[PDB]
Amino acid sequence: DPLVVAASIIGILHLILWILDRL
Amino acid sequence: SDPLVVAASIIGILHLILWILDRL
Amino acid sequence: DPLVVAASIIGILHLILWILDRL
Amino acid sequence: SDPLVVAASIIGILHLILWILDRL
Ligand SMILES: C[C@H](N)[C@]12C[C@H]3C[C@H](C[C@H](C3)C1)C2
Ligand SMILES: [Cl-]
């Protein structure tokens, strides 16, 4: 489903952004 | 087709939106 | 899949805890 | 069981672990 695929991409992006914000 | 996965998908998108706004 | 169920629950819990942290 | 969903599930669990630890 596009919703689950989009949320999966966004979840991976969120971790990337959060790690970068903390560092 | 799982309502929990659908709900958690919406919530995950909302979480990123809220977190970006909080940081900016 | 128990993994996707668990990540769904953890994702919901994560948003709740983070909102309460921000408040 | 899509590899993308499996990876994002693992990453979402890791994200909660890391975030709790950081806030502590
Ligand atoms: C990262 C999200 N908690 C989420 C949880 C579930 C696994 C994937 C896709 C969506 C459902 C959203 C990641
Ligand atoms: Cl934060």
Which residue is closest in CA terms to ligand 1's atom 9? A8
Residues of A in contact with D12 (CB under 8 A): 11, 15
Resolution value, angstrom units: 1.7
Residue from the list A8, A15, A22 with its beta carbon closest to the beta carbon of D22 = A22
Contacts of C14 by beta carbon, 8 Å cutoff, 6+ apart: B15, D12, D15, D16, D19
What are φ and ψ of residue D20, in 5° steps?
A: -55, -50
Write out the two tokens for B21: 């706004």
Q: Report whether B5 contacts A4 (CB < 8 A).
A: yes
- Tell me how the structure was determined: X-ray
Write out the two tokens for D23: 């806030």
Instruction: In whole angstroms, give the CA distance from residue B17 to residue B4.
Output: 20
CB atoms within 10 A of CB D17: 12
Q: Which chains touch B (3 or more CB pairs under 8 A)?
A: A, C
